Design a binder for this molecule. Structure first.
Ligand SMILES: O=C(O)c1cccc(-c2ccccn2)c1
Length: 242
């Protein structure tokens, strides 16, 4: 069952913004959100798509393992951290689009389409260019649909090998301390309106797991830090993390 708490809207409006946070308590099988409608509205996944893309690349052998080096192609781009060699871990960490565009080209349209259907991922629609459809093509996914997909990944239930799923969860590692572990991926969609930022993932505790998926209006890049900051403030308010 689902509960809506409209008072949580203050986390976004206090920053002159609008968005949705969706939380899922795995032990209790209960969900919570500030806005049930927006929780089910589908947006471009943008760099959150690097989760399924990594899985497919690993399972087909396009990527050998998390140490394989993807050499910079020598084209200077405006994100300094993209102008260097990467492996799967650093490509995830710095959301290196051109590395994942090469993954998608080697995966190919037919295998990509099949695998997203097998994952039940969003609207499963890869219309557009095979190396950019998650940025400006036809694929869409909602916050609740992100949760459904992430829960399968957590439980090793996606239709790829256990190894592929373990490696991607390693690459999602974002934060860890004595109190919790966060595995997550950010996203920033700008090529189609409305411009939004994403943060999706989960929080591991000693005896429970809380899945989360959030998106928020993002008219400029100045607010990107709000994706993680707001989410962690909700988690702290609900006493999930200290
Ligand atoms: O948060 C994001 O989704 C995002 C979007 C665009 C660029 C970068 C970035 C900046 C510095 C180093 C690496 N990547 C991150």
């Amino acid at each position: 069952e689902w509960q809506e708490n409209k008072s949580w809207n203050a986390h976004f409006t206090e920053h002159k913004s609008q968005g949705v946070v969706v939380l899922w308590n795995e032990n209790k099988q209960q969900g919570f959100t500030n806005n049930l409608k927006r929780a089910n509205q589908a947006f471009l996944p943008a760099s959150t798509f690097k989760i399924p893309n990594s899985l497919i690349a690993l399972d087909l052998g396009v990527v050998k393992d998390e140490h394989q080096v993807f050499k910079w192609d020598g084209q200077t781009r405006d994100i300094a951290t993209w102008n260097r060699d990467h492996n799967l871990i650093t490509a995830m960490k710095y959301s290196v689009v051109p590395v994942y565009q090469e993954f998608a080209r080697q995966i190919g349209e037919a295998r990509m389409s099949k695998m997203l259907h097998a994952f039940d991922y969003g609207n499963e629609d890869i219309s557009g260019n095979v190396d950019s459809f998650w940025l400006d093509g036809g694929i869409r996914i909602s916050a609740t649909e992100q949760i459904s997909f992430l829960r399968k990944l957590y439980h090793n239930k996606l239709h790829v090998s256990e190894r592929s799923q373990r490696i991607v969860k390693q690459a999602m590692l974002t934060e860890a301390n004595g109190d919790y572990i966060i595995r997550a991926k950010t996203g920033y969609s700008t090529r189609i309106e409305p411009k939004i930022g994403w943060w999706v993932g989960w929080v591991e505790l000693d005896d429970n797991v809380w899945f989360f998926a959030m998106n928020m209006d993002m008219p400029t890049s100045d607010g990107l830090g709000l994706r993680q900051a707001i989410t962690k403030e909700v988690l702290k308010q609900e006493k999930i993390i200290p």
